[model samples]
Target: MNTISSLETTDLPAAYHIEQRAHAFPWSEKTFASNQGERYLNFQLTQNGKMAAFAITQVVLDEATLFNIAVDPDYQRQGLGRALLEHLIDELEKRGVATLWLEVRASNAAAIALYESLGFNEATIRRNYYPTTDGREDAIIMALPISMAGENLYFQ
Candidate 1:
């Protein structure tokens, strides 16, 4: 079994190693560092004391974006992604976030399916937003409404 926890500075090296092999275009070490702040949400899943997956999101006002998520190839299809995503959704709801947004490679059928299964709907498309084997690929924008806040909502 894997446990999900807040991402710490010590987790970056392990995440970076996974990023290198998980995505055709991976975020640089600096990019990851810059995104860690008061408004950012980062989490990692560990199994047997090894990093198995991780995700990063940024919350602004009443919405949040799933900036990045990656699961080690060895752990794919084993429910790690779903578990991580569910954890993110719960955290967002706790923060009073009403909408969650994300973009997935148009060619990534597995990921698209996963997102759709989790209630994310196709919101739009970004033209040539990602690098591909030939050139650039489109990005499918997806959004999920996780909560609806009344006038009394607040965040700290």
Candidate 2:
């Protein structure tokens, strides 16, 4: 089983390693360092004394912006990702956030399914938002209303 907790400064090294291994478009060390503390709502999932997954979302006013989320590939399908996401939703609600929003690669079916399962609905697409090796990829925007019952899978 995995446990979700507020991220610590020490967790970044482990998360950095995981991100580098898990994605070709991993965030740089500067990006991780800069988001620490209050500007970022970061959550980490630990299993067997090791970090299995992590996510970062920023809350401003009554809205929450999901900047990034990634789980270790080896830990995928083990519910760690959902745990982190649910944790984020719970925290956002506690902060009185009214909306949750994020963007995903249009080609990422797994992510799309995950967001849909969490009650996110398609909003719009940002063309050429993500630069790819071949060219660029469209970003699919999605949002969910926090007031809607059961929109958060964390509590369910």
Candidate 3:
């Protein structure tokens, strides 16, 4: 079984290591450090005493943006990604976050499928939003409404 928990700044080294192995263009340590505030929320999934995946999100008002998410290459194809996402959704809903938004590289079919399966709908596409070997890649913007209520009134 996988264990999901809050990702602390102290866990950055390991999370960054996984980031290095999972993404061609990974966020820098400074970037991760900058997101260490209350507005930013992070989580880690662990299996067999090892880090399996991680997610970083930022909440503003009633909406949250998924800044980054990844499953370690060694643990890909497993259900860890889905598990982490569900956990994030539950946590966000509890905190009054009604909508969650994310952007994925257009070429990442697996990720796109995963997000779609989780009830996220494509809102738009950002042209040349990510760096790629062949120049740049388009990014698919996806959004999910977590709260079943009428409208979100939380302002913090």
Candidate 4:
């Protein structure tokens, strides 16, 4: 059975491997080593014995900034990303998080659409924020409060 759980040291090697394959700019081993459970919140999706997806977030007070999220290409379109995202959100809410923010490459249509569907809206834009193979890509800054009904953003 597949499970979502906090990342462990033993999982880093596999997680880093998935990151290298899932994105154009992958986080370094040091990045994973230092940030896994410190300023960043990382969780993994394990199927049988392999990691299928993961996400990272940086928290401050009652809010957090989503840093990176990815799924192994083999697991794309399986709702693994959404499951990881929702799992993170649920965990954050239970821990008293009030607002969440994230940045997505404007060129990532699927991710942009998914964030919007999950109640995130564009708050601003960062021009040429991501380094692409040949150039830089703009970033869409999005946010949602967790307490309201429309946005359903609340923290008790």
Candidate 5:
């Protein structure tokens, strides 16, 4: 069994630790901290009272941008990451968000596929936006108009 909840103040340290373990270029604590406020949405998933995953996002009126997400190394490949993202979308939709945006590294084909499967469509691109050990990679900005799907289009 697992629990999904708003990221508590107490959860940041553990969540950041997981981020460090999961990515070679993890966001600095400052990057994560700067995203917090009344307009930001952060959530964490825990299994057996320990953090499994965390997602960070920012909301602007009817739109939201998912900025960061990661799963604990030990919990990778077990679907917790997908589960957390699915839950994040559902929760954002419930909050009256009409559009959800995310930027993914172009080299991460599997991640791009997963986002597409969840109804995102590529909206823009920035060449060589992310630096890597070998070289920089392009970034694809994908948009998911949540309102157009099932939550009642705001266009009316």
Candidate 6:
């Protein structure tokens, strides 16, 4: 059975493994270890208890931002990203979030497309925000109103 649930500190190993496989500039294990802060919430998707995908975020007041999310490379393009995000957004709404925010690399077309498909609107761009192997790339700041979540028929 597949399950989506809270990711505790002990699960950092699995989450970090996915991170290394999913992104070219994956964060260090030390960074993933720091997700234990009071405001942060991490979630994992597992199939028969094997990790498949995970998301990490932090909530402040009535706002939440997705700090990092990843699916094991073998699991990409299989809708697991969408499924994890849908779950994450629903949980945020339940907590009375006013909006959901995320920053994506300007050159990452796939992630940009996914966010837009989910009703996320571009709020602005931060110049040379993400470091690339060659140099740096712009980061697009996107926002999704909580109200839009309920209005979208796809959520239900």
Whole-model Cα lDDT of every candidate shown, in order: 0.91, 0.86, 0.91, 0.85, 0.88, 0.89
Candidate that beats the other on TM-score, 4 or 6, i.e. the better one: 6
lDDT by residue (tens digit), candidate 3, 1-156:
789999998888889999999988988999878877889889999999999999999999999999999889999889999999999999999987889999999998988998899999999999999889989999999999997776569776
TM-scores of all candidate predictions against the true structure: 0.92, 0.89, 0.92, 0.88, 0.91, 0.90
lDDT per residue (tens digit) for residues 70-139 in model 4:
8999888988999998998888877777889999899989888998999898999999988999889899
> Where is the poorest 10-residue window by lDDT in model 1?
147-156
- Per-residue lDDT of candidate 6, residues 8-60 (tens digit): 88899989888888889888988888766789867899977699999999988
Candidate 5: misplaced stretches above 4 Å?
Answer: 148-156
Report the alpha-carbon TM-score of model 1 versus the true structure. 0.92
Q: Give the better candidate number (3 or 6) by TM-score.
A: 3
User: Deviation in angstroms for 125 in model 5?
Assistant: 1.2
Model 2, span 1-156: residue lDDT tens: 678888788899988988998888999999988877777788889898888888878877788888888888888888788778888888887877889999998889998998899989999999989999899999999998885444555653
Tens-digit lDDT string for candidate 1 (1-156): 789999888888999988997887899999888877888889999988989999999999988998899999888779998999999999889978899999999998988998999999999999999888799999999999999757796788
Candidate 4's error at 53, in angstroms?
0.8
Q: Please, what's the RMSD in Å of model 5?
A: 3.0
What TM-score, to 2 decimals, does candidate 3 have?
Answer: 0.92
How many clashes show up in model 6? 0
Clashes of each: 0, 0, 0, 7, 0, 0
What residue pairs are clashing in model 4?
145-153, 146-153, 146-154, 147-153, 147-154, 148-152, 148-153
